[PDB]
Amino acid sequence: MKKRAACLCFRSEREDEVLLVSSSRYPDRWIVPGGGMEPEEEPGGAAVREVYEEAGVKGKLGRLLGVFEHRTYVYVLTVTELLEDWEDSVSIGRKREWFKVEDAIKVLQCHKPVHAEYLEKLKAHHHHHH
């Protein structure tokens, strides 16, 4: 399996607002930040690196939301700092933006239904306080 990490970055512990970034292939579309993992890389470390590179995010890594299946480990993270200029903003003009979870689901549904699925699972888990 080709392994990937993805990360739901929240503005606070409320987990009501999530940071999406623009797609590198489709620059006007939104996606959940993440990427491919190196050999034997811990998915958690990869998530932290990816949000730093793609979204200019520093924060506190939280729980593994789940493993989705090429095979993606999806973590949550509480943002503590947003850098003004970051690697992908400089290199490819990648954008980032805060969305309410439901809005996020809406913009992801059409072309990134799998990413929307991450937030649907988040919602289901919220309902049961875990």
Short mmCIF file of N, CA and C in Angstrom, two decimals:
data_model
loop_
_atom_site.label_atom_id
_atom_site.label_comp_id
_atom_site.label_asym_id
_atom_site.label_seq_id
_atom_site.Cartn_x
_atom_site.Cartn_y
_atom_site.Cartn_z
N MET A 1 0.82 -1.21 0.00
CA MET A 1 0.00 0.00 0.00
C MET A 1 0.86 1.26 0.00
N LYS A 2 0.44 2.26 -0.77
CA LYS A 2 1.05 3.58 -0.71
C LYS A 2 0.41 4.36 0.43
N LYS A 3 1.22 4.75 1.41
CA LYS A 3 0.70 5.37 2.62
C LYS A 3 0.69 6.89 2.56
N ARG A 4 -0.38 7.48 3.09
CA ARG A 4 -0.53 8.92 3.13
C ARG A 4 -1.01 9.37 4.50
N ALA A 5 -0.72 10.61 4.85
CA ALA A 5 -1.28 11.23 6.05
C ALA A 5 -2.15 12.40 5.62
N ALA A 6 -3.14 12.73 6.44
CA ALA A 6 -3.92 13.95 6.24
C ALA A 6 -4.23 14.50 7.62
N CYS A 7 -4.55 15.78 7.69
CA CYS A 7 -4.71 16.40 8.98
C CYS A 7 -5.82 17.44 9.01
N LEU A 8 -6.78 17.23 9.90
CA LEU A 8 -7.82 18.21 10.14
C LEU A 8 -7.30 19.20 11.16
N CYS A 9 -7.01 20.41 10.71
CA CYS A 9 -6.46 21.46 11.57
C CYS A 9 -7.57 22.37 12.06
N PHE A 10 -7.75 22.43 13.38
CA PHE A 10 -8.84 23.22 13.96
C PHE A 10 -8.38 24.52 14.60
N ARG A 11 -9.26 25.52 14.55
CA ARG A 11 -8.92 26.81 15.12
C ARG A 11 -8.95 26.76 16.64
N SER A 12 -9.70 25.81 17.20
CA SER A 12 -9.76 25.67 18.66
C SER A 12 -10.21 24.26 19.04
N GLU A 13 -10.36 24.03 20.34
CA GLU A 13 -10.84 22.74 20.84
C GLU A 13 -12.33 22.50 20.54
N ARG A 14 -13.04 23.53 20.09
CA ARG A 14 -14.44 23.35 19.70
C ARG A 14 -14.55 22.44 18.48
N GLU A 15 -13.48 22.38 17.69
CA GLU A 15 -13.47 21.63 16.43
C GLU A 15 -14.64 21.99 15.50
N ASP A 16 -14.98 23.28 15.44
CA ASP A 16 -16.07 23.79 14.60
C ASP A 16 -15.55 24.40 13.30
N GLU A 17 -14.27 24.77 13.29
CA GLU A 17 -13.68 25.40 12.11
C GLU A 17 -12.40 24.69 11.70
N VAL A 18 -12.34 24.29 10.43
CA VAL A 18 -11.22 23.51 9.92
C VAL A 18 -10.51 24.25 8.78
N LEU A 19 -9.19 24.10 8.71
CA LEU A 19 -8.40 24.80 7.71
C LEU A 19 -8.23 23.94 6.46
N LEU A 20 -8.73 24.42 5.33
CA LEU A 20 -8.51 23.73 4.06
C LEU A 20 -7.43 24.47 3.29
N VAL A 21 -6.83 23.80 2.31
CA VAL A 21 -5.85 24.44 1.44
C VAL A 21 -6.25 24.20 0.00
N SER A 22 -5.72 25.01 -0.91
CA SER A 22 -6.03 24.81 -2.33
C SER A 22 -5.26 23.62 -2.88
N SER A 23 -5.86 22.96 -3.86
CA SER A 23 -5.25 21.86 -4.56
C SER A 23 -4.13 22.38 -5.45
N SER A 24 -3.06 21.60 -5.58
CA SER A 24 -1.93 22.02 -6.41
C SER A 24 -2.26 21.81 -7.88
N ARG A 25 -3.08 20.80 -8.15
CA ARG A 25 -3.52 20.49 -9.52
C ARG A 25 -4.71 21.32 -9.95
N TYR A 26 -5.61 21.60 -9.01
CA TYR A 26 -6.81 22.39 -9.31
C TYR A 26 -6.85 23.58 -8.36
N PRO A 27 -6.17 24.67 -8.75
CA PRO A 27 -5.84 25.77 -7.83
C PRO A 27 -7.04 26.55 -7.29
N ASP A 28 -8.24 26.31 -7.80
CA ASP A 28 -9.42 26.99 -7.25
C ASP A 28 -10.28 26.04 -6.43
N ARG A 29 -9.80 24.81 -6.23
CA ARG A 29 -10.51 23.82 -5.42
C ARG A 29 -9.86 23.68 -4.04
N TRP A 30 -10.65 23.21 -3.08
CA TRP A 30 -10.18 23.05 -1.70
C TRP A 30 -9.98 21.58 -1.35
N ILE A 31 -8.98 21.30 -0.52
CA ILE A 31 -8.73 19.95 -0.04
C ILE A 31 -8.27 19.98 1.42
N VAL A 32 -8.30 18.82 2.07
CA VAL A 32 -7.70 18.69 3.39
C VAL A 32 -6.20 18.52 3.20
N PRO A 33 -5.38 19.28 3.95
CA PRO A 33 -3.94 19.13 3.72
C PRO A 33 -3.43 17.76 4.14
N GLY A 34 -2.39 17.29 3.47
CA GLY A 34 -1.83 15.98 3.75
C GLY A 34 -0.84 15.68 2.65
N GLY A 35 -0.36 14.44 2.58
CA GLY A 35 0.62 14.09 1.57
C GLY A 35 1.11 12.67 1.71
N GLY A 36 2.06 12.30 0.86
CA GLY A 36 2.62 10.96 0.89
C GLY A 36 3.64 10.82 2.00
N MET A 37 3.68 9.64 2.60
CA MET A 37 4.62 9.37 3.68
C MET A 37 5.89 8.71 3.16
N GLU A 38 7.02 9.11 3.71
CA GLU A 38 8.31 8.51 3.39
C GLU A 38 8.34 7.07 3.91
N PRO A 39 9.39 6.32 3.54
CA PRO A 39 9.52 4.94 4.02
C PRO A 39 9.58 4.87 5.54
N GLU A 40 8.74 4.03 6.13
CA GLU A 40 8.76 3.80 7.57
C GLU A 40 8.54 5.06 8.40
N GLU A 41 8.00 6.10 7.76
CA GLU A 41 7.69 7.34 8.47
C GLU A 41 6.48 7.12 9.39
N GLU A 42 6.52 7.70 10.59
CA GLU A 42 5.34 7.72 11.44
C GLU A 42 4.33 8.70 10.84
N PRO A 43 3.07 8.27 10.71
CA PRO A 43 2.03 9.08 10.06
C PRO A 43 1.82 10.39 10.80
N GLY A 44 2.00 10.36 12.11
CA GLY A 44 1.84 11.56 12.93
C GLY A 44 2.86 12.62 12.59
N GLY A 45 4.13 12.22 12.51
CA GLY A 45 5.17 13.14 12.11
C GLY A 45 4.93 13.69 10.72
N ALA A 46 4.45 12.84 9.82
CA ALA A 46 4.17 13.26 8.45
C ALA A 46 3.06 14.31 8.41
N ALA A 47 2.01 14.10 9.21
CA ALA A 47 0.90 15.05 9.27
C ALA A 47 1.39 16.43 9.69
N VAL A 48 2.21 16.46 10.73
CA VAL A 48 2.75 17.71 11.25
C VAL A 48 3.60 18.44 10.21
N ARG A 49 4.44 17.69 9.52
CA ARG A 49 5.29 18.25 8.47
C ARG A 49 4.45 18.82 7.33
N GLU A 50 3.46 18.05 6.90
CA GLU A 50 2.62 18.42 5.77
C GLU A 50 1.84 19.71 6.00
N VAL A 51 1.24 19.88 7.17
CA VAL A 51 0.46 21.09 7.43
C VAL A 51 1.38 22.29 7.57
N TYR A 52 2.60 22.04 8.03
CA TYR A 52 3.60 23.09 8.08
C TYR A 52 3.96 23.56 6.67
N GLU A 53 4.21 22.60 5.78
CA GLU A 53 4.62 22.92 4.42
C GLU A 53 3.48 23.48 3.56
N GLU A 54 2.32 22.84 3.65
CA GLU A 54 1.18 23.20 2.79
C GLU A 54 0.38 24.39 3.31
N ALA A 55 0.26 24.52 4.62
CA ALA A 55 -0.64 25.52 5.18
C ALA A 55 0.06 26.53 6.09
N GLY A 56 1.35 26.34 6.33
CA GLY A 56 2.07 27.23 7.22
C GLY A 56 1.57 27.11 8.65
N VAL A 57 1.20 25.89 9.02
CA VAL A 57 0.58 25.62 10.31
C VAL A 57 1.57 25.05 11.32
N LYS A 58 1.55 25.61 12.53
CA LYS A 58 2.16 24.98 13.69
C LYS A 58 1.05 24.73 14.69
N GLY A 59 1.11 23.62 15.41
CA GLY A 59 0.09 23.35 16.41
C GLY A 59 0.34 22.09 17.21
N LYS A 60 -0.68 21.67 17.94
CA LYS A 60 -0.59 20.53 18.83
C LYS A 60 -1.31 19.34 18.20
N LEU A 61 -0.55 18.32 17.80
CA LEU A 61 -1.14 17.15 17.17
C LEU A 61 -2.05 16.41 18.14
N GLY A 62 -3.24 16.06 17.68
CA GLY A 62 -4.20 15.36 18.52
C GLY A 62 -4.37 13.93 18.08
N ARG A 63 -5.58 13.41 18.26
CA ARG A 63 -5.87 12.00 18.05
C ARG A 63 -5.85 11.58 16.58
N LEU A 64 -5.59 10.30 16.37
CA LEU A 64 -5.80 9.66 15.08
C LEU A 64 -7.30 9.49 14.92
N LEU A 65 -7.89 10.21 13.97
CA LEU A 65 -9.33 10.10 13.74
C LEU A 65 -9.65 8.74 13.15
N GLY A 66 -8.81 8.26 12.25
CA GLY A 66 -9.03 6.95 11.67
C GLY A 66 -8.11 6.69 10.49
N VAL A 67 -8.11 5.46 10.01
CA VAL A 67 -7.34 5.07 8.84
C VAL A 67 -8.30 4.74 7.71
N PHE A 68 -8.20 5.47 6.61
CA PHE A 68 -9.17 5.36 5.52
C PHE A 68 -8.56 4.67 4.30
N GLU A 69 -9.32 3.76 3.70
CA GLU A 69 -8.87 3.06 2.50
C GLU A 69 -10.06 2.71 1.60
N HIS A 70 -4.08 5.81 -1.26
CA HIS A 70 -4.30 4.37 -1.10
C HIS A 70 -4.64 3.96 0.33
N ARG A 71 -3.83 4.38 1.30
CA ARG A 71 -4.17 4.20 2.71
C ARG A 71 -3.78 5.45 3.48
N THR A 72 -4.77 6.12 4.07
CA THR A 72 -4.54 7.44 4.66
C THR A 72 -4.82 7.50 6.16
N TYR A 73 -3.81 7.91 6.92
CA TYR A 73 -3.94 8.13 8.36
C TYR A 73 -4.35 9.57 8.62
N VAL A 74 -5.56 9.76 9.14
CA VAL A 74 -6.09 11.10 9.32
C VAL A 74 -6.03 11.50 10.78
N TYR A 75 -5.24 12.53 11.07
CA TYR A 75 -5.11 13.08 12.42
C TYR A 75 -5.89 14.37 12.58
N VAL A 76 -6.15 14.75 13.82
CA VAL A 76 -6.61 16.11 14.10
C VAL A 76 -5.47 16.88 14.75
N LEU A 77 -5.53 18.21 14.66
CA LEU A 77 -4.49 19.08 15.20
C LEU A 77 -5.11 20.42 15.59
N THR A 78 -4.68 20.97 16.72
CA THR A 78 -5.14 22.28 17.15
C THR A 78 -4.10 23.31 16.76
N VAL A 79 -4.49 24.25 15.90
CA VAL A 79 -3.55 25.25 15.41
C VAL A 79 -3.16 26.22 16.53
N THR A 80 -1.86 26.44 16.70
CA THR A 80 -1.38 27.44 17.65
C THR A 80 -0.74 28.63 16.94
N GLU A 81 -0.30 28.44 15.70
CA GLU A 81 0.28 29.53 14.93
C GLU A 81 0.11 29.34 13.43
N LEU A 82 -0.23 30.43 12.74
CA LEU A 82 -0.26 30.45 11.28
C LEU A 82 0.84 31.38 10.77
N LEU A 83 1.80 30.81 10.05
CA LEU A 83 2.89 31.60 9.48
C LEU A 83 2.37 32.47 8.34
N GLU A 84 2.95 33.66 8.19
CA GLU A 84 2.48 34.62 7.19
C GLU A 84 2.88 34.21 5.78
N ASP A 85 4.12 33.75 5.65
CA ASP A 85 4.58 33.19 4.39
C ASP A 85 5.04 31.79 4.71
N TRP A 86 4.68 30.85 3.85
CA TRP A 86 5.08 29.48 4.09
C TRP A 86 5.49 28.81 2.79
N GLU A 87 6.09 27.64 2.92
CA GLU A 87 6.73 26.99 1.79
C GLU A 87 5.85 26.98 0.54
N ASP A 88 4.64 26.41 0.66
CA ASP A 88 3.78 26.24 -0.51
C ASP A 88 3.14 27.54 -0.99
N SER A 89 2.96 28.51 -0.10
CA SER A 89 2.45 29.81 -0.51
C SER A 89 3.47 30.47 -1.42
N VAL A 90 4.74 30.38 -1.02
CA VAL A 90 5.85 30.93 -1.78
C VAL A 90 6.09 30.16 -3.08
N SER A 91 6.09 28.84 -3.01
CA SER A 91 6.45 28.03 -4.15
C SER A 91 5.36 27.93 -5.22
N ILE A 92 4.10 27.75 -4.82
CA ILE A 92 3.04 27.52 -5.81
C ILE A 92 1.79 28.34 -5.59
N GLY A 93 1.86 29.30 -4.67
CA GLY A 93 0.72 30.14 -4.38
C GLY A 93 -0.44 29.37 -3.77
N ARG A 94 -0.13 28.34 -2.98
CA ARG A 94 -1.18 27.57 -2.33
C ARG A 94 -1.87 28.45 -1.29
N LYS A 95 -3.19 28.40 -1.27
CA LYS A 95 -3.97 29.18 -0.32
C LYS A 95 -4.48 28.32 0.83
N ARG A 96 -4.81 28.97 1.94
CA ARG A 96 -5.45 28.31 3.07
C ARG A 96 -6.65 29.14 3.50
N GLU A 97 -7.65 28.49 4.10
CA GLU A 97 -8.85 29.20 4.51
C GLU A 97 -9.62 28.41 5.56
N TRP A 98 -10.15 29.12 6.54
CA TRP A 98 -10.97 28.53 7.58
C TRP A 98 -12.38 28.29 7.06
N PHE A 99 -12.89 27.08 7.27
CA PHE A 99 -14.28 26.74 6.95
C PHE A 99 -14.95 26.16 8.18
N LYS A 100 -16.20 26.54 8.42
CA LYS A 100 -17.04 25.77 9.33
C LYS A 100 -17.09 24.35 8.79
N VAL A 101 -17.11 23.37 9.68
CA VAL A 101 -17.09 21.97 9.26
C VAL A 101 -18.11 21.64 8.15
N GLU A 102 -19.34 22.12 8.30
CA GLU A 102 -20.40 21.82 7.32
C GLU A 102 -20.14 22.48 5.97
N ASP A 103 -19.60 23.70 6.00
CA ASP A 103 -19.20 24.37 4.78
C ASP A 103 -18.06 23.61 4.12
N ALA A 104 -17.11 23.16 4.93
CA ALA A 104 -15.99 22.38 4.42
C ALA A 104 -16.52 21.16 3.68
N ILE A 105 -17.47 20.47 4.30
CA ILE A 105 -18.03 19.28 3.69
C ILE A 105 -18.62 19.64 2.33
N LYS A 106 -19.32 20.77 2.28
CA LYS A 106 -19.94 21.22 1.04
C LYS A 106 -18.95 21.46 -0.10
N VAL A 107 -17.85 22.15 0.17
CA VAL A 107 -16.87 22.41 -0.89
C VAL A 107 -16.03 21.19 -1.26
N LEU A 108 -15.97 20.20 -0.37
CA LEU A 108 -15.22 18.99 -0.65
C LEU A 108 -16.05 17.93 -1.38
N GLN A 109 -17.36 17.94 -1.15
CA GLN A 109 -18.22 16.88 -1.68
C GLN A 109 -18.05 16.63 -3.18
N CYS A 110 -18.08 17.69 -3.98
CA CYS A 110 -18.07 17.53 -5.44
C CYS A 110 -16.85 16.79 -5.99
N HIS A 111 -15.65 17.26 -5.67
CA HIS A 111 -14.44 16.72 -6.30
C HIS A 111 -13.52 15.95 -5.36
N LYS A 112 -13.68 16.14 -4.05
CA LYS A 112 -12.89 15.40 -3.07
C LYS A 112 -13.77 14.67 -2.06
N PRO A 113 -14.70 13.83 -2.55
CA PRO A 113 -15.68 13.19 -1.67
C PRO A 113 -15.02 12.41 -0.54
N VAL A 114 -13.83 11.86 -0.78
CA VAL A 114 -13.13 11.12 0.26
C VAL A 114 -12.72 12.03 1.41
N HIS A 115 -12.30 13.25 1.08
CA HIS A 115 -11.96 14.22 2.12
C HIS A 115 -13.20 14.62 2.92
N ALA A 116 -14.33 14.78 2.23
CA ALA A 116 -15.60 15.07 2.90
C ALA A 116 -15.93 13.95 3.88
N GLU A 117 -15.59 12.73 3.49
CA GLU A 117 -15.80 11.56 4.33
C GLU A 117 -15.04 11.66 5.66
N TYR A 118 -13.86 12.28 5.66
CA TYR A 118 -13.12 12.47 6.90
C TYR A 118 -13.94 13.31 7.87
N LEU A 119 -14.56 14.37 7.36
CA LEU A 119 -15.32 15.29 8.20
C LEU A 119 -16.66 14.70 8.62
N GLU A 120 -17.25 13.87 7.77
CA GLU A 120 -18.45 13.13 8.15
C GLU A 120 -18.13 12.21 9.34
N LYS A 121 -16.97 11.55 9.30
CA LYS A 121 -16.59 10.70 10.42
C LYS A 121 -16.30 11.54 11.66
N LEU A 122 -15.69 12.70 11.47
CA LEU A 122 -15.46 13.60 12.59
C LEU A 122 -16.80 13.94 13.25
N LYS A 123 -17.81 14.23 12.43
CA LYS A 123 -19.12 14.63 12.95
C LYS A 123 -19.77 13.50 13.72
N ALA A 124 -19.67 12.29 13.18
CA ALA A 124 -20.24 11.12 13.83
C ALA A 124 -19.57 10.89 15.18
N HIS A 125 -18.25 11.05 15.22
CA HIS A 125 -17.51 10.89 16.47
C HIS A 125 -17.82 12.02 17.47
N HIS A 126 -17.99 13.24 16.97
CA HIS A 126 -18.38 14.36 17.83
C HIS A 126 -19.67 14.04 18.57
N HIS A 127 -20.63 13.51 17.82
CA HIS A 127 -21.95 13.22 18.36
C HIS A 127 -21.85 12.34 19.60
N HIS A 128 -20.85 11.47 19.62
CA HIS A 128 -20.63 10.59 20.77
C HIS A 128 -19.49 11.05 21.68
N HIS A 129 -19.08 12.31 21.52
CA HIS A 129 -18.04 12.92 22.37
C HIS A 129 -16.74 12.13 22.40
N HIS A 130 -16.30 11.66 21.24
CA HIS A 130 -15.00 10.99 21.13
C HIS A 130 -14.45 11.05 19.71
#
